[PDB]
Amino acid sequence: MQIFVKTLTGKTITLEVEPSDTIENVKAKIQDKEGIPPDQQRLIFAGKQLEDGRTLSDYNIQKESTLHLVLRLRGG
Amino acid sequence: GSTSAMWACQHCTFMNQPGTGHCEMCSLPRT
Ligand SMILES: [Zn+2]
Known part of the structure; x- marks a missing residue:
């Protein structure tokens, strides 16, 4: 399946993942596409924080889903 | 008596504490 990644900057990234994969794979993908660190990458899902130790289906994510990426770094 | 609750972000949509x-x-x- 494919999942959408909406960034707070105003960008949407579409990737290819599966409901059996792991959040670690989804974050690793966005990295190969954009180049954002996994440690700083914050995957949000309708009020849920995905973890590399979990699975896409673990949270109940379907095909063509839409997540929100967030960078956790110094700023203010 | 009056326990607080979580709050869904209004920017990134993250569920905060x-x-x-x-x-x-x-x-x-x-x-
Ligand atoms: Zn937020």
Whole structure:
């Protein structure tokens, strides 16, 4: 399946993942596409924080889903 | 008696905690 990644900057990234994969794979993908660190990458899902130790289906994510990426770094 | 509650972010859509004045993800202040 494919999942959408909406960034707070105003960008949407579409990737290819599966409901059996792991959040670690989804974050690793966005990295190969954009180049954002996994440690700083914050995957949000309708009020849920995905973890590399979990699975896409673990949270109940379907095909063509839409997540929100967030960078956790110094700023203010 | 009066227990707080969580709060869904209004920018990144991250579900924050009841004691999280700001978002621990986007770092933006709640409300
Ligand atoms: Zn947020």
